[PDB]
Each structure stands twice: as structure tokens, then as C-alpha cells.
Design a protein around this motif. Sequence first.
Motif, PDB file in Angstrom:
ATOM      1  N   UNK A 287       0.828  -1.171   0.000  1.00 36.45           N
ATOM      2  CA  UNK A 287       0.000   0.000   0.000  1.00 36.45           C
ATOM      3  C   UNK A 287       0.868   1.227   0.000  1.00 36.45           C
ATOM      4  N   UNK A 288       0.285   2.366  -0.337  1.00 43.36           N
ATOM      5  CA  UNK A 288       1.034   3.622  -0.289  1.00 43.36           C
ATOM      6  C   UNK A 288       1.723   3.820   1.076  1.00 43.36           C
ATOM      7  N   UNK A 289       1.050   3.435   2.175  1.00 45.84           N
ATOM      8  CA  UNK A 289       1.568   3.575   3.571  1.00 45.84           C
ATOM      9  C   UNK A 289       2.935   2.843   3.747  1.00 45.84           C
ATOM     10  N   UNK A 290       3.280   2.004   2.794  1.00 45.18           N
ATOM     11  CA  UNK A 290       4.532   1.333   2.892  1.00 45.18           C
ATOM     12  C   UNK A 290       5.702   2.330   2.897  1.00 45.18           C
ATOM     13  N   UNK A 291       5.551   3.558   2.352  1.00 41.90           N
ATOM     14  CA  UNK A 291       6.597   4.569   2.367  1.00 41.90           C
ATOM     15  C   UNK A 291       6.954   4.969   3.789  1.00 41.90           C
ATOM     16  N   UNK A 292       6.051   4.796   4.745  1.00 41.26           N
ATOM     17  CA  UNK A 292       6.336   5.120   6.121  1.00 41.26           C
ATOM     18  C   UNK A 292       6.981   3.997   6.902  1.00 41.26           C
ATOM     19  N   UNK A 293       6.854   2.766   6.445  1.00 39.40           N
ATOM     20  CA  UNK A 293       7.300   1.653   7.243  1.00 39.40           C
ATOM     21  C   UNK A 293       8.799   1.620   7.388  1.00 39.40           C
TER      22      UNK A 293
ATOM     23  N   UNK B 184      -4.867  -4.056   7.730  1.00 36.55           N
ATOM     24  CA  UNK B 184      -5.377  -2.707   7.885  1.00 36.55           C
ATOM     25  C   UNK B 184      -4.793  -1.998   9.100  1.00 36.55           C
ATOM     26  N   UNK B 185      -4.013  -2.696   9.929  1.00 35.73           N
ATOM     27  CA  UNK B 185      -3.554  -2.123  11.164  1.00 35.73           C
ATOM     28  C   UNK B 185      -2.169  -1.540  11.007  1.00 35.73           C
ATOM     29  N   UNK B 186      -2.038  -0.268  11.340  1.00 31.29           N
ATOM     30  CA  UNK B 186      -0.763   0.441  11.392  1.00 31.29           C
ATOM     31  C   UNK B 186      -0.330   0.561  12.835  1.00 31.29           C
ATOM     32  N   UNK B 187       0.937   0.303  13.090  1.00 32.61           N
ATOM     33  CA  UNK B 187       1.516   0.499  14.409  1.00 32.61           C
ATOM     34  C   UNK B 187       2.637   1.504  14.329  1.00 32.61           C
ATOM     35  N   UNK B 188       2.613   2.465  15.257  1.00 28.11           N
ATOM     36  CA  UNK B 188       3.681   3.467  15.420  1.00 28.11           C
ATOM     37  C   UNK B 188       4.192   3.340  16.849  1.00 28.11           C
TER      38      UNK B 188
ATOM     39  N   UNK C 253       6.101   4.886  23.786  1.00 27.93           N
ATOM     40  CA  UNK C 253       4.703   4.878  23.418  1.00 27.93           C
ATOM     41  C   UNK C 253       4.489   3.891  22.277  1.00 27.93           C
ATOM     42  N   UNK C 254       3.272   3.422  22.140  1.00 31.34           N
ATOM     43  CA  UNK C 254       2.887   2.582  21.011  1.00 31.34           C
ATOM     44  C   UNK C 254       1.421   2.732  20.750  1.00 31.34           C
ATOM     45  N   UNK C 255       1.096   3.007  19.499  1.00 33.45           N
ATOM     46  CA  UNK C 255      -0.286   3.058  19.081  1.00 33.45           C
ATOM     47  C   UNK C 255      -0.457   2.108  17.885  1.00 33.45           C
ATOM     48  N   UNK C 256      -1.586   1.447  17.861  1.00 34.67           N
ATOM     49  CA  UNK C 256      -2.042   0.675  16.711  1.00 34.67           C
ATOM     50  C   UNK C 256      -3.441   1.122  16.340  1.00 34.67           C
ATOM     51  N   UNK C 257      -3.712   1.225  15.040  1.00 31.25           N
ATOM     52  CA  UNK C 257      -4.937   1.863  14.598  1.00 31.25           C
ATOM     53  C   UNK C 257      -5.250   1.450  13.169  1.00 31.25           C
ATOM     54  N   UNK C 258      -6.495   1.686  12.830  1.00 28.89           N
ATOM     55  CA  UNK C 258      -7.015   1.570  11.482  1.00 28.89           C
ATOM     56  C   UNK C 258      -7.363   2.982  10.999  1.00 28.89           C
ATOM     57  N   UNK C 259      -6.966   3.326   9.790  1.00 28.01           N
ATOM     58  CA  UNK C 259      -7.257   4.655   9.281  1.00 28.01           C
ATOM     59  C   UNK C 259      -8.741   4.986   9.375  1.00 28.01           C
ATOM     60  N   UNK C 260      -9.020   6.173   9.885  1.00 22.97           N
ATOM     61  CA  UNK C 260     -10.398   6.668   9.987  1.00 22.97           C
ATOM     62  C   UNK C 260     -11.149   6.234  11.206  1.00 22.97           C
ATOM     63  N   UNK C 261     -10.569   5.399  12.055  1.00 25.69           N
ATOM     64  CA  UNK C 261     -11.264   4.774  13.189  1.00 25.69           C
ATOM     65  C   UNK C 261     -10.684   5.261  14.497  1.00 25.69           C
TER      66      UNK C 261
ATOM     67  N   UNK D 193      -5.164   9.064   6.185  1.00 27.41           N
ATOM     68  CA  UNK D 193      -4.209   9.322   5.112  1.00 27.41           C
ATOM     69  C   UNK D 193      -4.816  10.300   4.123  1.00 27.41           C
ATOM     70  N   UNK D 194      -4.232  11.492   4.011  1.00 26.85           N
ATOM     71  CA  UNK D 194      -4.765  12.591   3.202  1.00 26.85           C
ATOM     72  C   UNK D 194      -3.698  12.903   2.182  1.00 26.85           C
ATOM     73  N   UNK D 195      -3.907  12.394   0.972  1.00 25.59           N
ATOM     74  CA  UNK D 195      -2.889  12.376   0.001  1.00 25.59           C
ATOM     75  C   UNK D 195      -1.881  11.454   0.574  1.00 25.59           C
ATOM     76  N   UNK D 196      -0.623  11.879   0.522  1.00 23.31           N
ATOM     77  CA  UNK D 196       0.525  11.194   1.118  1.00 23.31           C
ATOM     78  C   UNK D 196       0.817  11.531   2.557  1.00 23.31           C
ATOM     79  N   UNK D 197      -0.122  12.156   3.250  1.00 31.99           N
ATOM     80  CA  UNK D 197       0.228  12.623   4.571  1.00 31.99           C
ATOM     81  C   UNK D 197      -0.617  11.929   5.597  1.00 31.99           C
ATOM     82  N   UNK D 198       0.013  11.317   6.607  1.00 29.82           N
ATOM     83  CA  UNK D 198      -0.742  10.775   7.726  1.00 29.82           C
ATOM     84  C   UNK D 198      -1.107  11.952   8.649  1.00 29.82           C
TER      85      UNK D 198
END
Length: 139
Positions: A7-13, A55-59, A68-76, A94-99
Motif C-alpha cells: 500500500x502507499x503507507x509502505x513509504x512510512x514503514x 489494515x492495522x498500522x503500528x507506530x 509509546x505505542x499506538x495501533x490503529x485503522x485509518x479513519x477509526x 491518510x490525506x494524500x501522502x500525509x498521515x
Amino acid sequence: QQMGRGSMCDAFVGTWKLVSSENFDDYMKEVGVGFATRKVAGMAKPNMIISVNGDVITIKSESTFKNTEISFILGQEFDEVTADDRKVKSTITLDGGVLVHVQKWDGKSTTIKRKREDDKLVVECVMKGVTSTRVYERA
Ligand SMILES: COc1ccc(CCC(=O)O)cc1C
């Protein structure tokens, strides 16, 4: 039981390390962080690990100030207790390329934007008129 697509979000991983910060003390002041916490938090040079699984992103932030640690689904919306110990309600999209990460608490709001710029991951923290820019490099 199959290998999913990217997915596009792979640029952040990946694994990121803080290399510069600007105006973070003033951002923290605007947020309402107290003196001792600002001083300790402002020294930290965290490592941030971003991963995606379905669908789960972890930061994750591994920090000499507060892990800190957060896990989330976009928009939720989800509950987050922040490094400075605020209990917030957060929504990340995710708004364009920006989280875009919005935190709400005690009738206040702050937005954290994360974007890829060249080989960096730039983090822009905005409380009202006050912005802090934090630059991460690959670890
Ligand atoms: C208001 O206090 C804050 C707010 C945001 C962060 C995370 C900044 C980053 O991920 O680089 C950390 C703290 C301590």
C-alpha cells in the motif's frame, strides 16, 4: 493465508531516528506540558518504528523520555495516552501522502502530520498558531 499486497503507507514503514527538532518546547507549552516534562521530553531522540499488518498500522516510539505505542485503522477513533500523559481520543487518516493524526482532549485539539520528504520522515506538530517540525532519518 496469502501474501497481501502493498500500500502507499509502505513509504512510512521502517525504523526512524530523530535528527532535528524545531520549536518543540513552544509546541509543548501550547499543548499545556509542564516545565519538568518539557525539559526531559525535549532531550529525547526517539526511535520510531512504523509497521503495517493488514489494515492495522503500528507506530512505536522507543524513547529515553516515555515509550509509546499506538495501533490503529485509518479513519477509526481510538484511545491514546500520549508521551506527556494526556488521555486523548485520536483519529488518523491518510490525506494524500500525509498521515494526519488528530488528538482531542479536554475540549482541545492538536494535529500531528507525518510525511515523507526525500529520505526523511517529517513530523509537523500543530497546536493553534504554534508548529514544531521534527525530522527523522532512517535508523
Ligand atoms: C506534547 O508533548 C508531546 C507531543 C508529541 C510528541 C511526539 C513527537 C514525535 O513523535 O516526534 C511527544 C510529546 C512529549
